[PDB]
């Protein structure tokens, strides 16, 4: 209740930070390049296809993850798709760290006892 | 300094200085200075602290171990100081979980757009 | 359809399912489910916790006017003998299988050990 | 522990299995091939380091992430190491599936019984 407002402030701050913009700018670079927005969708589709089989515990023979990984290096091949993946991971692990930092105060309290 | 990191340390300090944290901090202070509620508190910590590490080195844990714990927990709930704490303590933790969830929206929102194609 | 680990997993599912300790849990479940009162509380705490989950997952405020009672709800539930036993046995199982999940990881973890 | 016995049996089967054995094989062909084991050591350390930095909550500029993915990409180019990678992942996913199928009976009861 008291905290939320601080959270929305952080959400706004995040979304507005240069890093996140950079990321957005990169999504656009790819979305706007016929060539690149192809590869991306390809990876995306094989990725979602795997995730799904997994959510229902289905078998996934090596065939599959081999193609998966293939397509991914082909991905890290095209300039524009590369920075997107690069920036997306750095955004992905960075906000993951933000979240850890927020849990800090509570870990502090625990230490105390 | 990475802007986000800084914003997050900022977030940390705000939470610390917030009122609910201090409510919590003071709640701990209580059950810590009440010889009665402190023993139970402690008792519950260790039983729960031992079961943990017994699960890590993976070792069978009979019923009693859990009923003992389940019971030792109940009596702690029967305490006043401990309850206040046990609650503030839990709410704080869901509030936070919620905060970190908001931190994930900008990226959650963008991830969604990746489904555009 | 042929993956061995898959089939192996199906086997495990049935093994746990037919094991002696699972049948005990299920019987504890049956006790409560058949006895009106315990059943009642059981569903309250469920509904309660379900509501909270709903809220937090939706990102809404959760003043102690909720996490408070919910913590009570569990209280005079932790009491009902029938419902207590279920809760007890339930966790024994949660933990038991959790350990089982660990052992399965073993081989790949020993190999990751080498990898370094 | 009642299901413990059962557990060890699953472990035995798991490591004894054809797929677990080929994962071993694949790891062997890289350990004994200069080019791939050089590459493998390298990417394994980049990934070891990144993970260290995140635990420690340290910042991680895009450099590392770019430079890192550059490598993971070079690695997918080496047949030997490409196989290791793919098998290590397939085994990883599959084990996780084994784990989840295990909770299946308890979660099922806790939901559907009443």
Q: Which string of DSSP letters, residue by residue, matches C17-85?
A: HHSHHHHHHHHHHHHHHHSHHHHHHHHHHHHHHHHHHHHHHHT----HHHHHHHHHHTHHHHSSHHHHH
In terms of Cα–Cα distance, which of B83, C70, C82 is closest to C90? Answer: C82
- The answer to whether the Cβ–Cβ distance between D109 and C29 falls below 8 Å is yes
Burial class (CB in 10 A: 0-12, 13-18, 19+), C85: buried
A63 touches chain C (CB under 8 A): no
B101 touches chain C (CB under 8 A): yes
C-alpha angle B13/B18/B21, rounded to 5°? 95
Q: Kindly state the tokens that stand for B83.
A: 């309850």
- The answer to whether the Cβ–Cβ distance between B87 and C103 falls below 8 Å is no
Say which CATH topology domain A1-113 has: YheA-like fold (1.20.1500)
In terms of Cα–Cα distance, which of A53, A109, A94, A46 is closest to A74? Answer: A46
Alpha-carbon gap: B109 to the closest alpha carbon of chain C (Å): 15
Cβ C92 vs Cβ B64: under 8 Å: no
Q: What element of type H or E holds A57? A: none
Question: What dihedral do alpha carbons C96, B74, C61, C58 form, nearest 10°?
Answer: 20
Rounded to an integer, what distance in angstroms lies between the CA atom of residue A95 and that of residue C26? Answer: 42
Say which CATH topology domain B1-117 has: YheA-like fold (1.20.1500)
A4 touches chain C (CB under 8 A): yes
Rounded to an integer, what distance in angstroms lies between the CA atom of residue D27 and that of residue A75? Answer: 25
Resolution in A: 2.9
Rounded to an integer, what distance in angstroms lies between the CA atom of residue D108 and that of residue D87? Answer: 31
In terms of Cα–Cα distance, which of D113, B47, B55, B72 is closest to C25? Answer: D113
| Size of chain B in residues | 117
CATH of domain C2-115: 1.20.1500.10
Rounded to an integer, what distance in angstroms lies between the CA atom of residue A29 and that of residue A92? Answer: 19
Task: Report how far Cα B31 is from the mean position of its chain's Cα atoms.
Answer: 16
Residue A58 falls in which region: left (phi positive, over 0), alpha (psi -120 to 50) or beta: beta
D1 touches chain B (CB under 8 A): yes
Could you tell me the CA-to-CA distances from B103 to A96, B111, B117, D64 in Å, in that order? 9, 14, 25, 23
Cβ A7 vs Cβ B99: under 8 Å: yes
Q: Kindly state the tokens that stand for A10.
A: 């952080």
Rounded to an integer, what distance in angstroms lies between the CA atom of residue D22 and that of residue D19? Answer: 5
In terms of Cα–Cα distance, which of C17, C15, C21 is closest to C93? Answer: C21
Q: Kindly state the tokens that stand for C6.
A: 């898959």
Cβ B30 vs Cβ B37: under 8 Å: yes
Coil, strand or helix: which one is D44? Answer: helix
| Partner residue opposite D59 with nearest CB, options B2, B59, B60 | B2
C20 touches chain A (CB under 8 A): no
Angle of the D79-112 helix axis to the C4-18 helix axis, nearest 10: 20
Cβ A26 vs Cβ A83: under 8 Å: yes
Cβ A29 vs Cβ A36: under 8 Å: yes
| Partner residue opposite C104 with nearest CB, options D95, D104, D113 | D95
- The answer to whether the Cβ–Cβ distance between B70 and C52 falls below 8 Å is no
Cβ C32 vs Cβ D14: under 8 Å: no
Structural domain boundaries of chain D?
A: 1-113
Contacting residues of D for B5, CB less than 8 Å apart: 59
In terms of Cα–Cα distance, which of B106, B47, B107 is closest to B76? Answer: B47
In terms of Cα–Cα distance, which of A71, A62, C112, A48 is closest to D76? Answer: A71
Instruction: Tell me which chain A residue has its CA closest to the CA of residue C59.
Output: A4
Could you tell me the CA-to-CA distances from C11 to C18, D78, D96 in Å, in that order? 11, 37, 16
Rounded to an integer, what distance in angstroms lies between the CA atom of residue B86 and that of residue B46? Answer: 16
For A24-88, strand residue ranges (E) read: none
Cβ B28 vs Cβ B20: under 8 Å: no
Q: Which residues, including other chains, have CB under 8 Å from residue B61's CB and lie 6 or more apart?
A: B51, B54, B55, C92, C95, C96
- The answer to whether the Cβ–Cβ distance between D70 and A90 falls below 8 Å is no
Burial class (CB in 10 A: 0-12, 13-18, 19+), D63: exposed
Which 8-state DSSP code applies to residue D61?
-
D10 touches chain C (CB under 8 A): yes
Q: Which residues, including other chains, have CB under 8 Å from residue C48's CB and lie 6 or more apart?
A: C69, C70, C73
Angle of the B80-103 helix axis to the B35-56 helix axis, nearest 10: 50
- The answer to whether the Cβ–Cβ distance between D20 and C96 falls below 8 Å is no
| Size of chain A in residues | 113
Rounded to an integer, what distance in angstroms lies between the CA atom of residue A52 and that of residue A72? Answer: 18
Q: What element of type H or E holds A35? A: none
Which 8-state DSSP code applies to residue A78?
S
Q: Which residues, including other chains, have CB under 8 Å from residue D73's CB and lie 6 or more apart?
A: A72, A73, A76, A77
Q: What element of type H or E holds B16? A: helix B3-17
A56 touches chain C (CB under 8 A): no
Q: Kindly state the tokens that stand for B30.
A: 């209580």
Which 8-state DSSP code applies to residue C100?
H
D41 touches chain C (CB under 8 A): no
- The answer to whether the Cβ–Cβ distance between C64 and B70 falls below 8 Å is no
> What are the start-end ranges of the H helices in B57-103?
63-77, 80-103
């Amino acid at each position: 209740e008291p905290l939320h407002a601080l959270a929305r402030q952080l959400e706004q701050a995040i979304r507005a930070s240069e890093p996140f913009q950079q990321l957005k700018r990169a999504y656009e670079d790819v979305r706007r390049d016929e060539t690149a927005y192809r590869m991306f969708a390809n990876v995306r589709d094989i990725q979602l296809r795997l995730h799904e089989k997994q959510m229902r515990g289905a078998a996934i023979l090596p065939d599959e993850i081999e193609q998966a990984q293939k397509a991914m290096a082909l991905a890290q091949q095209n300039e524009k798709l590369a920075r997107l993946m690069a920036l997306e991971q750095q955004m992905s692990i960075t906000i993951a760290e933000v979240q850890q930092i927020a849990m800090k105060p509570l870990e502090e309290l625990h230490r105390s006892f």
